[model samples]
Target: MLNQELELSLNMAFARAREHRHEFMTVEHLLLALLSNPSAREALEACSVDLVALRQELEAFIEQTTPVLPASEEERDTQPTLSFQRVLQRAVFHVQSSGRNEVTGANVLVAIFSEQESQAAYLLRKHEVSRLDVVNFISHGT
Candidate 1:
């Protein structure tokens, strides 16, 4: 129940990644999908992130990558890159560590920061968005 929204975001993220011809789901795909979702967008905005610039940077990165042949249904269903899975797991950790039963988009966004080497984190850092900033924003509503 708590995971429903995040699951939807993940499904859409996978579809978006596959649509872009990427071989495996990456953190950038998830970031884009989150921006497209209201809750995630709200969380990001609260962090004082420039949503447009972030999107542009992500697009530029995606455009530079080579596309792969379309994946089979099995591959699509099971083949998210290991790093992407780690990001999701980190979201769960955040939720649990915070003593919350429900997972929200803010948790997911922070989880991306947990993957310091991921493209998503790089883009966020480029925009001056940090885990501490986002967490502070979420907690203080500023």
Candidate 2:
């Protein structure tokens, strides 16, 4: 089962990618969407990340890096990249393993770290938001 906020974040990520005509919805896009999620937002702040500044940085990076679909195929929907799918599946499995009924954005945020090669994971580390901090916060609300 997915958390309501998780669903909303995924929808937001998809919508944003489609709006910009991105070739694929990437893990970075998912991270950008998670910035607005309740649990992920809380976790990020706890890690001392400035949400506003981070949002701007991610937006610029996503726009700069993503190639837009041509006008001729403007109607084509954005597809999720393999990494994005992996992140979500891993998050859901993690929650299920913990006996949690719903997988929150915080869970997915942690899962993104498993994508070691992804920009989403890199950006978080660049801000000093380590996987350790996130896991501690998620597990103990520290």
Candidate 3:
């Protein structure tokens, strides 16, 4: 069983993620969103990650991180400027690709731990970012 608060948090995060059009609610993405969220900031600060510091880093990182558009997305597409919804949609799609039946706390953690080496390897594998180069952009140097 998952922690009730954790589950609720994850659900809330996923909802926000979807609202932002993220493909897969990655730990990094979640952290970024949470840091941006007034309500979640306090809780995010309690985590191993430093919410505030990571936010600045990610803001800069994302500015440079070339997005890997989904299969259906085309270069000709005149989509609106990227926003939080676009990020969330990308994260949702990423989790769905990982064989997760649905978005949940377990799914979020699975996506997070896969990129974090400190986590237990016996756990399931999930990937959100396409390049290792950007993992630190989100995960390190707090």
Candidate 4:
């Protein structure tokens, strides 16, 4: 189950992706959504990341990777990319592994950073955020 905040963040993610005409919601969209979300924002900022740099890079990454053509009507209703789906699955696993009934932004963060070759993970690494940093934050953050 997703908590209210987490659910809102996901809706925001999909909305943002559609707003930008992305054919599919990728992990980059997920990261952007996490940053928009309060719980995820607090936890991510707690790791001392440069939020501006993160956002800037994310925007650039999205532009670089997302298709230039506006989404077709069918594609405009974006589906999750396979990578994004895997991230969600991992988020659920994280919720279960941590003994939580609801998925939180921290779990989402972990899922994003956990992927080695994902574009979202690449952006985080470019901005000096790491999987261990996120894990530590989730383990210790308020």
How many clashes does each candidate structure show, in the order listed?
A: 0, 0, 21, 0
Compose the digit string of candidate 4's lDDT tens values, residues 6-46: 99989988787777777777888888888877888887787
lDDT, model 3, position 73: 55
Better of 3 and 4 by TM-score: 4
Model number with the top lDDT = 2
| Every model's TM-score | 0.82, 0.94, 0.34, 0.89
Cα lDDT, all candidates: 0.75, 0.87, 0.41, 0.80
For residues 1-142, could you state the per-residue lDDT of candidate 3 as single tens digits? 3335444664676565445444443345444444444333433333344444455665455334424345565453222233333433554676567554444332333244344442112121222223343334333422
Candidate 1 lDDT over 71-116, as tens digits, reads: 4444444257777778778888767887778887777887888788
Which candidate leads the pack in TM-score?
A: 2
Cα TM-score of candidate 4? 0.89
Please identify which of the two predictions, 2 or 3, would achieve the higher lDDT against the true structure.
2
TM-score of 3: 0.34
Question: Which portions of model 4 show Cα errors greater than 4 Å?
Answer: 68-73
The total of clashing pairs for model 2 equals 0
lDDT by residue (66-109, candidate 2, tens digit) is: 88998884549988889999999999888899987889999999
User: lDDT, candidate 1, residue 22?
Assistant: 69
- Full ranking by lDDT: 2, 4, 1, 3
